[PDB]
């Protein structure tokens with residue numbers, strides 16, 4: 001509790017995941033089919049859906065839809081394992097090998113494939129939940145406990161165990177350049193990330209909200225979350241944000257539900273902290289959130305949560321097959337053709 005204010009007394013409760021002692025890693029896989037029309041993605045999305053039901057499949061998996069650049073959409077699965085060896089065995093399963101790593105994607109194909117697989121060391125991971133909710137990413141399969149370590153600037157860092165001994169910094173005084181345009185269509189590309197990047201999934205869940213809370217969330221809060229994410233996508237150098245996606249979650253059948261989340265990679269957790277604490281875009285969000293809590297008596301069915309991880313280069317595998325150049329990590333760092 002290095003950053004906790006003196007006599008800290010949070011006003012709102014919060015919960016955080018408490019991992020069992022035999023758990024050393026969480027595998028968080030984002031797998032995306034990229035298309036201009038969802039009909040072209042239908043066949044791929046069927047094969048992958050069945051693969052998640054294998055005995056070696058993820059402990060939990062969400063679907064989400066992302067509207068990306070230039071009319072291209074990403075149909076994404078967000079899949080979790082609590083054992084890397086089980087995930088490795090799922091990949092090697094022959095049904096998965098039919099489509100893994102864009103194997104079905106030709107160089108003249110109308111769809112793209114991408115995957116960003118992060119193997120998260122547990123001491124480099126933390127979660128926060130506005131309520132005792134068992135349907136928030138890892139809280140589907142990991143118990144959560146009440147925490148006082150929240151509601152101050154630095155609490156995220158303090159909730160992450162390794163920050164007791166590590167600064168988690170990126171190189172001093174250096175920034176992301178302007179994004180570079182790659183010739184990524186028709187190619188199988190691999191990107192190598194630097195050490196200590198920070199990945200956040202921060203989520204909004206209003207499916208249990210009544211008439212009043214839903215109108216206030218859609219009308220007041222969501223517009224500024226969108227503005228936040230748009231700003232982040234367009235100001236990589238200034239913010240340190242490598243990649244930011246606002247996605248809307250879907251049923252197994254792909255119908256949109258009243259849930260969204262932002263998935264962002266940052267050059268370091270300090271970059272994420274500086275944006276969150278000092279930028280007006282989020283200051284705005286936090287301000288329309290308290291203005292919504294003032295319109296409904298600070299009694300909320302809205303549910304928020306986030307998962308934050310700090311990754312070494314070798315913890316994350318970034319593969320883009322026949323993808324648009326602005327996808328994910330493609331505009332930054334070292335790209336390599338896969339043979």
Ligand code: HEM
Nearest residue numbers: 150151152153154155156202221225228229262276285289
């Ligand atoms: C691009 C979207 C967002 C990003 C990247 C983001 C990021 C963060 C981060 C990193 C923190 C922890 C800061 C720290 O502990 O030092 C935080 C805290 C917080 N955020 Fe956001 N957030 C986003 C959207 C939202 C939304 C949509 C809401 C509410 C509707 C929100 C409300 C809050 C609140 C209330 C806290 C305080 C949590 C606590 O009790 O510690 N944020 N956010």
